[PDB]
Amino acid sequence: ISPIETVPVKLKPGMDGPKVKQWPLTEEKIKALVEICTEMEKEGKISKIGPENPYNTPVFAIKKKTKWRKLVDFRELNKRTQDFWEVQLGIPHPAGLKKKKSVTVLDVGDAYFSVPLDEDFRKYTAFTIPSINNGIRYQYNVLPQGWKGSPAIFQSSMTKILEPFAAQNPDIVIYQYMDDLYVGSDLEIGQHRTKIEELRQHLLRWGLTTPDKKHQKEPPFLWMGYELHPDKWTVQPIVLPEKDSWTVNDIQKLVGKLNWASQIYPGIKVRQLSKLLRGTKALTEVIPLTEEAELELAENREILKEPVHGVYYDPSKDLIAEIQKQGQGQWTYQIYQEPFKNLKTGKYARMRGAHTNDVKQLTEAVQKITTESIVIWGKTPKFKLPIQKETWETWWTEYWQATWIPEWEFVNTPPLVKLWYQLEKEPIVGAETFYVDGAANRETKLGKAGYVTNKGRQKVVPLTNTTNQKTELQAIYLALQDSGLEVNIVTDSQYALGIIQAQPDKSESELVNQIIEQLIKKEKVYLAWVPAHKGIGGNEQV
């Protein structure tokens, strides 16, 4: 079976072929391996070879509990073989598929064995079936199963094979995934079956068999963790385990399944569980479950109680994205064309820092959605967002970092994204000026936070088990606690200055959160910085 051209293959430079010996396993499977190898010899898939290849790869035979399968271990050869263009990893997302009147699934059997292997490379595929006294030598003429080059070379071969058929049939759309072909068309059912038959025979001319019966797979289709119905898609049912104790492995699989659920079931929250997964220690140990994680999990269970589906994609209809706040640090989004019919859903939980605010997270969510949309639909969607032009404009104008804000429309669906507070850009007249400082002995971890004001008020609060940074935040917090609704605060800490000027409404540290509550309760707050250890109102202490 020459007509398929062979891809040239080389070993890695400086490397020879595998000499690894056959491991007996003198068990009766020998004869099995004979029978199979005779059949494959009849079909020209393999060949007996002269006494000097010289090379070897281990061959095995088994039946998992009637048939017998030959399994060759190509690991050593695979390490010694050149890389090939990476075979398809990413799969088409169901939400990106365009609805077709008829869809057929074609599994080609013995896919790899139907494609010839490069002649000069065949000697390296040699294997031995053991004689009882000590054997018969064989080599592959086709792409072996388990070999490094098989998927990419078969992929290429299949593409080239498919070109002439697709050329004369532009109205039918063919997806190629591994061995499978998925063939859609809008043609009448009869002539669709006809076109399928044509494709089948065309493939048969290249030595590729397709399902002979009325094709083995019927709607719906279980494919890569999905259910594909003619009019809709969804995910295969997600079963969340119930345990008293959880290891880090269990939590990884849990957040995995939940992540998988998030693309369709709206409202999924993974954050607190991955917070549990912040421990990287090798995956054995029992990880303590936090109340927040338990709550999160329970809510997820309540969401997964109801059945949910997505729809398929129409290029003529607009692409629309909508975003809602899920509570602390967490967001959820829906992508749809028809208003209540979701193409898909998702989430954004990421802080990407110890502190952030709502608008920043929203903008990041928009970014993630944009990327995903480009990947799946090859275009960016329209955004319906729960934020007002004034809010966002003020934010991105006063934001030091460059940002891209799309065309969007304000939808009013509380909670609305808002600025909980805004620091003053100018010092406040009539407001008390707090000169703050804090310090800690790095050895003893003991510290203090204090202020002196222009009204003549001075205070010092003692602190235990703390650092200079935390004390410098502590001082600011202290000045917030003891002042009126309007306050001027002066600090020598670049750290604290950086944290507050960023205007976070949420944080990992409870100290910063307290500071945020204070800032919200305030009306006017101005933060100013001065260089430390120069003549200044606030002075210094130890």
Partner 1 sequence: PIETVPVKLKPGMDGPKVKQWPLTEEKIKALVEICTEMEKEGKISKIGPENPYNTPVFAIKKSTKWRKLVDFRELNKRTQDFPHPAGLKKKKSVTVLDVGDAYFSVPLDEDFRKYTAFTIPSINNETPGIRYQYNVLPQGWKGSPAIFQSSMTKILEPFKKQNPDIVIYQYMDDLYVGSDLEIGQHRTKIEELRQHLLRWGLTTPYELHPDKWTVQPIVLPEKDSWTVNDIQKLVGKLNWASQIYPGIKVRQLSKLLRGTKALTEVIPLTEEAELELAENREILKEPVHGVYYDPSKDLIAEIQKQGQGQWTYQIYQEPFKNLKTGKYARMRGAHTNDVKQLTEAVQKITTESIVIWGKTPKFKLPIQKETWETWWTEYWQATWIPEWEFVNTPPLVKLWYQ
Residues 160-189 that bind ligand 3LQ (CB under 6 A): 173, 175, 182-184
CB of 413 to ligand 3LQ, least distance (A): 31
Break positions in the chain: residue before each gap, C to N over 2.5 angstroms = 65, 134
CA-CA distance, 452 to 458, in Å (whole number)? 4
Span from 55-63, 323-331, 383-391, 434-442 in contact with Mg ion (CB under 5 A): 434-442
Among ligand 3LQ, partner 1, Mg ion, none, the one that 477 touches (CB under a kind-dependent 5 to 8 A) is none
Is 358 marked as a binding-site residue?
Answer: no
Q: Where in 76-115 is the site for Mg ion (CB under 5 A)?
A: 107
CB of 108 to Mg ion, least distance (A): 8
Is 179 marked as a binding-site residue?
Answer: yes
At 332, phi and psi to the nearest 5? Answer: -140, 150
Q: Tell me the angle at which helices 494-501 and 468-482 cross, rounded to the nearest 10 degrees.
A: 60
Near ligand 3LQ by CB under 6 A: residue from 36, 95, 105, 321: 105
Near ligand 3LQ by CB under 6 A: residue from 146, 230, 267, 406: 230
Map residues 61-100 to x or -, x wherever contact with ligand 3LQ holds by CB under 6 A: -------------------------------x----xxxx
Is 171 marked as a binding-site residue?
Answer: no
What tokens were used for 333? 């989004």
Return the DSSP state at 431: S
Strand order in the sheet with 127-129: 46-48, 136-140, 127-129
Near ligand 3LQ by CB under 6 A: residue from 74, 112, 127, 312: 312
Q: Which residues of 406-421 are buried (b: 16+ CB within 10 A; e: fewer)?
A: eebebeeeeeebebeb
CB atoms within 10 A of CB 273: 23
Is 83 marked as a binding-site residue?
Answer: no
Near Mg ion by CB under 5 A: residue from 17, 37, 97, 179: 179
CB of 395 to partner 1, least distance (A): 12
Closest to Mg ion by CB, 214 or 278: 214
At 210, phi and psi to the nearest 5? Answer: -125, 165
Strand order in the sheet with 342-348: 342-348, 331-336, 320-325, 382-385, 408-410
What tokens were used for 214? 């009325």
Is 482 marked as a binding-site residue?
Answer: no
Is 120 marked as a binding-site residue?
Answer: no
Closest to partner 1 by CB, 332 or 356: 356
Closest to partner 1 by CB, 336 or 435: 435
Span from 31-39, 321-329, 381-389, 491-499 in contact with Mg ion (CB under 5 A): 491-499
452 binds ligand 3LQ (CB under 6 A): no
106 binds ligand 3LQ (CB under 6 A): no
* 385 backbone φψ class: left, alpha, beta (φ>0; ψ -120 to 50): beta
Return the DSSP state at 121: G
Among ligand 3LQ, partner 1, Mg ion, none, the one that 354 touches (CB under a kind-dependent 5 to 8 A) is none
User: Using CB atoms within 10 A of its CB, is residue 133 exposed (0-12), middle (13-18) or buried (19+)?
Assistant: exposed
In terms of Cα–Cα distance, which of 134, 135, 141 is closest to 119? 141
Residues 6 or more apart whose Cβ sits within 8 Å of residue 197: none
Q: By CB under 6 A, name the binding residues for ligand 3LQ.
A: 92, 97-100, 103, 105, 173, 175, 182-184, 219, 221, 223, 228, 230, 312
Task: Output the known binding site for Mg(2+).
Answer: 107, 179-180, 437, 472, 492
Q: By CB under 5 A, name the binding residues for Mg ion.
A: 107, 179-180, 437, 492, 532
